[PDB]
Design a protein around this nucleic acid. Sequence first.
DNA 1: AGTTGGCCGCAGTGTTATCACTCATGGTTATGGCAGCACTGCATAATTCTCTTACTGT
Lengths: 247, 247
Amino acid sequence: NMKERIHEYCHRLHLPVMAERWSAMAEYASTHNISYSEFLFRLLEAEIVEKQARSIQTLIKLSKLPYRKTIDTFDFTAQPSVDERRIRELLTLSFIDRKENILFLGPPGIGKTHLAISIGMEAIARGYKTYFITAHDLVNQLRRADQEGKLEKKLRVFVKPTVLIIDQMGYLKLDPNSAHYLFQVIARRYEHAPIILTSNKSFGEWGEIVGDSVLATAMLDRLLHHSIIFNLKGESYRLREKRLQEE
Amino acid sequence: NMKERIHEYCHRLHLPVMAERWSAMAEYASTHNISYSEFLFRLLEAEIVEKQARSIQTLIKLSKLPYRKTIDTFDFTAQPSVDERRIRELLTLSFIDRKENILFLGPPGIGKTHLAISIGMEAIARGYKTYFITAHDLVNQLRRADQEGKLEKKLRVFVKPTVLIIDQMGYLKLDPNSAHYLFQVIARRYEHAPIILTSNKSFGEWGEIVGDSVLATAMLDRLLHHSIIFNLKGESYRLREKRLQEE
DNA sequence: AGTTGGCCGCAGTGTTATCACTCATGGTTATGGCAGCACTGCATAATTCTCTTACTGT
Ligand SMILES: Nc1ncnc2c1ncn2[C@@H]1O[C@H](COP(=O)(O)OP(=O)(O)OP(=O)(O)O)[C@@H](O)[C@H]1O
Ligand SMILES: Nc1ncnc2c1ncn2[C@@H]1O[C@H](COP(=O)(O)OP(=O)(O)O)[C@@H](O)[C@H]1O
Ligand SMILES: [Mg+2]
């Protein structure tokens, strides 16, 4: 017949959702006499919707972001120190065009990691590749790669992502070898793609964190050449939620 | 014949209890006209019960508890400051789903480790894995593993168990540089599995014990977010309670 | 009569001087292969579970 061949060809072209909604839209046109152009537009637009939904799901899976949290889930009133203007301007992704390294600083529990993850979710929803990693894990993987001789591979894997996120930078101390391993990534991404970083220590302490003042200075210079910092302060939201649960 | 073949097949299928009791079960089903399905169900249920008993035995063996205790041997009249009902509620193991952390704080000998091990035993009974360790011991083992280079193995060993019983947090103080191991364990188990902590040092002394203020602050911020803290006020049972009640 | 050794004769090798040829490098243009990314499958290694074994002293 004809329907079977249509379905088979759609599957061979990998457009099954198109075929399904194509029957629905064919019925719709039979009911309202839609032009062939608009009909095909419905088919292809819905196929695009499904394909991009699946692609964004698999991309979030590709990225190691801990959770799929959106800015909508966040409250600004509980954190007076932040301003919606700057956060939403970052959400506009102008930094990607300008290649600005976003940095978050402040004591624990403020929510800097939450905001960074939300920004990453927006970036990965808009097609841009994203990759999440912790400083300690990044350094460990780089050292193992250097040991195995595949250092270039991991360096590419950490540099290729359009938006690289480094988290928990400062709580754990780093040795000079780790300092140079981090410096390699920083240099490769000096002016090629933005870096989103979160930390609790001031810039000066990075010398003690990395075990070398000069390496810390160089990395800070390269990171801050094009950067927008967010020095946030306030009460730990974990503690406040615990208090609310108590009451 | 058939009896010997049945015994051999039960042993080859790893059904020892079934091999032992199949004759008696057959006789009982004979004398009561039990259906074949119910006969099979009886055999399988007995085998399952015995297997679960042996599994619980193995889990309690691997728990590495110093000894075995339960709430049965606990007197709440000697500890009237804290509510009895809350501990009974904990015995329902509702905290395992919520991933909340259970903290016992009080003077030495007031029964902290007793209650912690009792709750761990209740968790082991219902199949949940549990690992008992002393905080300083855990940090030392993690340091040795890191020196040997295979740190991730021990980290998984400590993070995988559903219930972690970290005791004697303040008893001993290792080199402050090793507190990052404790932070790693607490953060990796954060929002994943409960932690049972028991110690006699206030929350302010953590910076001194670990030799780092911000590190201890972050550890507590994560360990106290989802938790139920019990503060035990009293005197050393073994000496003071007997001395004051024999009068 | 046969085999080996010595002598003679013939051929091959070494050094010096000279000649010839081939290979390498530089510049420009074109083509092919390899590398990178994404998805799927298999195998190996590591981890977990269960049972048995080992060590020391009474
Ligand atoms: N203003 C807020 N409104 C709602 N949730 C908040 C707010 N601030 C923080 N949180 C919540 O606090 C939790 C922890 O946030 P986050 O991990 O970003 O903290 P942090 O300060 O970066 O921590 P650390 O220094 O330990 O890495 C998240 O669940 C986030 O949702
Ligand atoms: N409320 C109590 N009821 C029964 N026994 C108790 C109680 N408190 C303490 N004990 C006894 O004391 C010991 C527990 O002390 P523990 O809490 O381990 O002290 P620490 O926490 O300093 O190690 C156990 O042997 C237990 O039998
Ligand atoms: Mg964070």
